[PDB]
Paper text:
The crystallization of functional hetero-oligomers of CPN60 did not succeed, whereas the crystallization of CPN60β1 homo-oligomers was achieved by the sandwich method. The crystals belong to space group P21, with 14 subunits per asymmetric unit. In our study, the first crystal structure of Chlamydomonas chloroplast chaperonin homo-oligomer (CPN60β1) was solved at 3.8 Å, and displayed a rigid body and structural features such as looser compaction, a larger central cavity, less contact sites, and an enlarged ATP binding pocket compared to GroEL. In overall architecture, CPN60β1 presents as a typical type I chaperonin, with a 7-fold symmetrical cylinder structure consisting of two stacked rings composed of seven subunits. Similar to GroEL subunits, each CPN60 subunit consists of an equatorial, intermediate, and apical domain. (2) The structure of CPN60β1 is loosely compacted; a closer view revealed that the equatorial domain of CPN60β1 extends away from the central axis, with E1 (aa residues 2–136) and E2 (aa residues 410–525) domains rotating counterclockwise and clockwise, respectively, in comparison to the equatorial domain of GroEL, although the overall structures merged well. The number of amino acids involved in contacts in one CPN60β1 subunit is much less than that in one GroEL subunit, especially in the apical domain. The ATP binding pocket in CPN60β1 is wider, suggesting that adenosine may be more readily released. In CPN60β, positions 153 and 154 are occupied by glycine residues that have no side chains to aid closure of the ATP binding pocket upon co-chaperonin binding.
Though the authentic chloroplast chaperonin consists of both subunit types in vivo, homo-oligomeric Cpn60β is functional in refolding model substrates with assistance from co-chaperonin in vitro.
Numbering used by the authors:
A (entry chain G), B (entry chain J), D (entry chain D): 4 to 531
C (entry chain H): 415 to 531
The structure:
């Protein structure tokens, strides 16, 4: 029931599947990207211009080249949920490292020193990427970046600008439509954490796969939960008042989780799962930081009350909660704002009496998000399709602006990959063995691939484009906009990419190329 | 579990399927159109002379050429539900743009500049079609247009003429048969909106797929509905009195919707689900505008009464309601007519004190539909088969007259396509790259196809027909009626097409041809 | 020589508006244009260098000062002073004959052949 | 009637045929070589230990891989008939350059710069090989070189030593057996030239394929011969006295050549066909130089006598003549010895008055071979199988000594290929493009193959042997004798290779590898 795939040809098999995945996502990339028609599950088809949707659906027949393509999808998806964008760039780079890599490995070259050369080259190219990055420190230059990054006209990008000009750091801006055609900015008592849901089956509305609920109660305990009889009494407390319930008590075992997803699938009980922030004594100090913030108490056994019947004030209230893959956000609830203004005083109290170091930064990261709150913005409405088109445009705007200000900004169009590629020629490594040099040249020719695929599928030769950009001075922000086909500086024109996307897609692509070329034997279950 | 289709031949596969759809719908077009024999679901076959029924049923085996034909079906269907007619013209034009498009693309021509040439050429031809259009401003010329557009004799078209001569603009004229052989015009308190029902499974009587109910109560709220216990109590209120119920509270979630379609499938509960008009504060200002109009209060939680039970006070009444895909119409109810005469006074009061701009037109579009009401016409009855034949003839008449008065009128017979096609030769674009010129020539040779297929399948060479019409002066309304096979001015004879049909079918055909030629990779889930 | 004279010849069909300027004859002109691009492409490619960039460098620069590209040394050089020259008789005859056989090729529509049995 | 083979796999096909040839000749190499069994043409099979016999008989089925192996056979054969040995080394190095060549080329590497790197590397390694060579200048060290290069005991090698100690340079030593058991040295009037036979069908006794005839007359002219009736009259003179005839008049056309091989195949006429020495006026000055030496006049038309008949006056005599592929030798005749002593006087007179340069060296090369004469040696006789074993041993001895004294001497065992290999690391070429460096590393890894195959098929790991010699100093003649399996100096022990063999096999192997990797398309005539 297990199949054995070995030697050199077994590598080329999944390489083909990888190359097939990069072939379809490859024609997706670029401003003049091509459409990809997806067969409907039932009825009218679905055309796609994005690289994210394609990477979701692709899975070949042949198992070896399927798991190879799936292996790249990991880097693509990981880049997507750690940067917000760059699925197309991560995939083509991943295949680039793999194609050029195996091109050299085929000469019997030592794979170990090759991947070693790749890791160190890209790592120093990340250290170089931070140098290439452009930093924004003024809210007015932040306004120009936000509006340009936003699709087409400014105005709305000029609204998000002052929206984050109010809340300085630590975020976090959340958006929503309605109700009258104006620009309504709202700041209320809201908070967030860097934890995620328990199961991806809780997604409320795909393909956004983000669970959003309005006017719901929240429940928190520090210990692990496995019993059910306590919850089914809160279920009765959730049936008494037909309202959804929020639960994030660290680890929920398979028993309670199965009961939760079953009761949610029928629509009788609207339940939510997720995980706990921090660790140890931090957990019991973070859940009680949001319990009263939501207007609820703690059901911990440290005092301690923990029985069968749970009531109204054992669970806090939250007007709106929006959670995703690696983030969980609460907002809207009109509870004790004094709590938000008193706990910050307690943090300052603990901060000044603290002699340690880790406690200082833990109190600093808590006072940050607490003071930051959660500013929610309301967009206007011309028609009914205009507000939706806006909401999507401002969704991609916010995520782009956040990803840009986070790690800095670099010239887009994939031209920054060339400027990075033309800096490996000066890299004299240790112990400068030829294999590691091959790995450096591999990264060079691999970083050449993205800009080539962009220009080519646009309708122009990429070789001449590469020559014209590289031969010229690489410092005065020289670039090539495929949208207009003309020699232009990518900065002043308005073609920019967030440095976070470039770095993440680069490191991940090397990461999967690492575990790809290092492979020598593949196993797979068969049918019979 | 996914198949991969790439390269140039993958395009030709679905192009063939598109070509197959335009083949059967192609022999349908023309006054001397042919019959298409359809195999019945169970029993005697069904002959079809309509292009609508054909486009609904067609779906080939090979998935790629199936989703290709279906992709054109989207254009044909969208044209039908936005213009009322022109499914045949949309399909043949769509395949025309595709055939002539691929005919040039196969020469390695840039798809981006081609489709750019197509979009701009047809868009300026839309601006040109508005010039070609003839306007109706008199009720007597409207009478001549209506009677001619109506099948055969006038009288009944002369009845619809004065029917709309009464209600000037904004509509909306509804028809019905019975009971005594005369011409009975009836104006009552009726209203309509540009919203649609939730699920296409609520259709009362196919193939009209329009949900019609008589003597039924109404119910509306602004907030989203997800709970059911309140509904099952109103269900009991709908069981004590064996009468259907009307619900239109924006978004009904999957739970309540499933309960609704299940209770409707058994015939125990006659229900329906429909969306909300306007957005935000408009919604709560539109549902209460139809609440008292139907003789019912508002059950909004803005203050706000909303519990388990519900009586006659919270639900209005409606004699007859007819809803379709993108329209929802109410009429007949003999409630507070003073409401319809007092709310218009409130609008005038608000209009007087309004300083904004959007509020002026929102009050103007509401005062329009309110003042216009809903005139319902009753047709005569000779026999029992004559009243049905009439009712069908007056149905297609009303839909044609509305589509003709909405966007103006153009000379039919597809001759207006030639007059539009012989105006691309003077279009010098920017930056006048040869590819865009090819796209212009593609539009030219594509517009030649419909009239060619019309004359051909009729029984005469289309080459000589095109020559005679084109060589002669294109301005004095010169045309060719295939029904009589003779030189004739399309205006004074009676062969006229609504400009809305021509424009919508033309724009949608380019729209699907856009997402067709731009495509380069197609995916499809396979069997094993 | 170097097949560069074919580029200079190809970039002078863009100025040729013929009679009666029917689109078909213009296609044939563009056909000759793209066909004259092939030889230099094959020379540069099979030598070991991208021909697209070479074609770009020579064409974008002034075509009159005898600018060319020697594939033997791989460098920007004037074909005259360097020593890479082709006889015009060869260029003319090979060009006319190629069109002559292309004439009797595309014109063909039916081909016959005696079979074995 | 022509088959087409292109792309990357076509190269691999004939590479496999090459690799299969080097596989069987590969197990031939080494002091502990293996036996290869050949199926007889008719009867008992033939066991082979030589690499020459194997390379002669090998020819595969698939034409592409057949002409591939034959293409290496050319280098092997050419190396043999120009150095006297090194067929096994030539083949394995040839395949080495090819295998390592295809290995790097597969990485999309430019073939032109690769072969350029190989050419220059081996060329400088040839210049380096001359430095590596150990020169012999004394007859006693020549005696030690001769006796050691001779199989087993000295004595007979000590006889060849003084045999060439008499005739200093320019050769040429010839051997023969009989008649009584002693060592009989004989010096007589003999001469040689570097021309060859017209057709390989004149071979008297295979597999030596060397035409030897005793007691035969000679005949030569300068002009081309095509007419036959003249030779027919001389044929009657060859029948008049049933004796073989010698002919060497430049170019004999297909007519006379066909008549010659036909009359020879039946045995009625014993004829010999060969070319003329020198060119132009040199020809008529060389044939007349050997005419009187053989005791015969010149039949040139410059005086001029040239008719149908021919007597003893027009033809000279030669006791014994032995001709091969690239050499033609005469000896034994007791003619006018004064001629050999007078023509040398004429050369001294001409050289004394010569002001030119080419005439100086042409008279110098003629005075050389003339003064050198021929020395013929007679071997002893123990048993009937003894001198037959001796004559073969002394045949291999003479050819080895000549090949060694010609170009110099280098340490054998294939170790000299290692020392040459570990000198490419210091070679910094121009313009030091990476491709040429790959070619240098290719030569490095390819030179490793011969010694590895020698040690491996002997019965010991080659990796440790290569490591022991390379890590140790490469200068004190350190090596590894596979015959004894011990660390020893190759010079004092007795394992030495002639530098002529190493150079020729090396240059030829690169020569065929040049025209092998440079190939991109192969054609082949097929069956049907």
């Amino acid at each position: 029931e297990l199949h054995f795939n070995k030697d050199m040809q077994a590598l080329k098999r999944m390489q083909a599947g990888v190359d097939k995945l990069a072939t379809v996502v490859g024609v997706t990339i670029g401003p003049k990207g091509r459409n990809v028609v997806l067969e409907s599950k039932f009825g009218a088809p679905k055309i796609v211009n994005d690289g994210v949707t394609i990477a979701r659906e692709v899975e070949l027949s042949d198992p070896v080249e399927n798991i190879g393509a799936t292996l790249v999808r990991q880097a693509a998806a990981r880049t997507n949920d750690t940067a917000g964008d760059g699925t197309t760039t991560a995939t083509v780079l991943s295949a680039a490292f793999i194609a050029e890599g195996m091109k050299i490995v085929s000469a019997g070259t030592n794979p170990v020193q090759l991947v070693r050369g790749m890791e160190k080259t890209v790592q120093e190219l990340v250290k170089e990427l931070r140098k290439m990055s452009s930093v924004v420190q003024t809210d007015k230059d932040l306004a120009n970046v936000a509006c340009v990054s936003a699709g087409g006209n400014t105005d709305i990008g000029s609204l998000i600008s002052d929206a984050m000009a109010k809340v300085g750091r630590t975020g976090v801006v959340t958006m929503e439509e309605g109700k009258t055609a104006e620009d309504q900015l709202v700041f209320v008592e809201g908070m967030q954490f860097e934890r995620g849901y328990t199961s991806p089956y809780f997604v409320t509305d795909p393909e956004r796969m983000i669970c959003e609920y309005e006017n719901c109660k929240i429940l928190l305990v520090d210990k692990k939960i496995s019993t059910a009889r306590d919850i089914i009494t809160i279920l009765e407390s959730a049936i008494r008042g037909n309202y959804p319930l929020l639960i994030m008590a660290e680890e929920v075992e398979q028993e309670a989780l199965a009961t939760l997803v079953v009761n949610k699938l029928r629509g009788t009980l609207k339940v939510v799962a997720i995980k706990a922030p921090g660790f140890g004594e931090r957990r019991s100090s973070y859940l009680e930081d949001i319990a009263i913030l939501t207007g609820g108490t703690v059901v911990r056994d440290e005092m301690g009350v923990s029985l069968e019947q749970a009531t109204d004030a054992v669970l806090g209230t939250a007007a709106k909660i929006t959670i995703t893959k690696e983030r969980t956000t609460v907002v809207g609830d009109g509870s004790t704002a004094a709590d938000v203004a008193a706990r910050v005083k307690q943090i300052r109290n603990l901060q000044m009496q603290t002699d340690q170091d880790y406690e200082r930064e833990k109190l600093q990261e808590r006072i940050a998000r607490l003071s930051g709150g959660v500013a929610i913005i309301q967009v206007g409405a011309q028609t009914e399709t205009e507000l939706k088109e806006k909401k999507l445009r401002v969704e991609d705007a916010l995520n782009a602006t956040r990803a840009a200000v986070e790690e800095g900004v670099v010239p887009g169009g994939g031209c920054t990959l060339l400027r990075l590629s033309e800096k490996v020629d000066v890299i004299k490594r240790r112990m400068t063995d030829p294999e590691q040099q091959m790995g450096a040249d591999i990264i060079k020719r691999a970083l050449c691939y993205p800009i080539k695929l962009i220009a080519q599928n646009a309708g122009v030769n990429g070789s001449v484009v590469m020559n014209e950009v590289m031969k010229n001075l690489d410092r005065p922000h020289y670039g090539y906009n495929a949208a207009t086909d003309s020699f232009e500086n990518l900065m002043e024109t308005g073609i920019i990419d967030p440095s976070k996307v470039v770095r993440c897609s680069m490191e991940n692509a090397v990461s999967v190329a690492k575990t790809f070329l290092l492979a020598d034997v593949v196993v797979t279950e068969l049918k019979e």
